[PDB]
Structure 1
Amino acid sequence: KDPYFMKNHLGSYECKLCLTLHNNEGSYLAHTQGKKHQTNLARRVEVKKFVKIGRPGYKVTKQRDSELFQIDYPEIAEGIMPRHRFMSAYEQRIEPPDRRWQYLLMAAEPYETIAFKVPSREIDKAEGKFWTHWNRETKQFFLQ
């Protein structure tokens, strides 16, 4: 099984390793033994479906600060912290007209997401590890 000897379009034999031609069949088998041929041979989804959704009534309290909202949530008995994320109003269930604002929504596993609309462009940061906190001893969530 020689992977270098092939058949051309003229009824001949071609060695692509040394790029040589042979007319008859007796010259292709005699071209493997030699110096040039030897030189060429030597050179070469689960967590989303299991999430319970009962949608309780959340308790959010906003306060205009100057230099922050407090969400009162029940005990979840889990290490998963509720995550906050800022999204646009272009995606909705019924898609209302004149939706050109942004909304910051906080979501948890046993509870429903609470969303607050922000008419301003940039007045704060919606990052989770930067300016957010979740006290599990009192179960109090804050984001500033």
Structure 2
Amino acid sequence: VEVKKFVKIGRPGYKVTKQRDSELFQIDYPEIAEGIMPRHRFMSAYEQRIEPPDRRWQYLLMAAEPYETIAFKVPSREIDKAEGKFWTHWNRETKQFFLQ
């Protein structure tokens, strides 16, 4: 409750770059100067501010404390894993966030 109320929200413009891999998205974020890594989570389209019709898909959204959350819709059922400690990385030297 204390961390959610003291979180500043200016909502800057994020820079996401997707690429279809085969065996992965790159989000360019500014310097946050904190140890809190940006977290990704997959949610449903049933909850919204206006609740539009025909919403039956899922969206993976990455969020950070000084920046706004960037969400990408996934029409497929399961093609990857949205876990944080499994297939995600955050280089604080170049401030590059990657998720596959």
Q: Which category describes the TM-score, using the shorter chain as reference length?
A: over 0.9
Cα distance in 1 for residues equivalent to 2:93 and 2:74: 30
What is the CA-CA distance between 1:107 and the residue it aligns to?
0.1
**Deviations 1:30-78 (Å, cap 9, x if unpaired)?**
xxxxxxxxxxxxxxx0000000000000000000000000000000000
**Deviations 1:96-123 (Å, cap 9, x if unpaired)?**
0000000000000000000000000000
- Per the normalisation by structure 1, the TM-score is 0.69
Q: Which runs of 5+ in 1 are unaligned?
A: 1-44
What is the CA-CA distance between 1:136 and the residue it aligns to?
0.1
Structure number with higher helix proportion: 1
SS of the counterpart of 1:47? Answer: helix
Cα distance in 2 for residues equivalent to 1:132 and 1:57: 21
SS of the counterpart of 1:130? Answer: coil
CA RMSD in angstroms comes to: 0.1
What is the CA-CA distance between 1:86 and the residue it aligns to?
0.0
Structure 1 residue runs of 4 or more that deviate by more than 6 Å after TM superposition? none
- Per the normalisation by structure 2, the TM-score is 1.00
Residues 1:56 and 2:9 are matched in the alignment:
no
* Percentage of matched positions with identical amino acids: 100
Cα distance in 1 for residues equivalent to 2:6 and 2:90: 23
Whose relative contact order is higher, 1 or 2, with alpha carbons under 8 Å and at least 6 apart? 2
Q: Which runs of 5+ in 2 are unaligned?
A: none
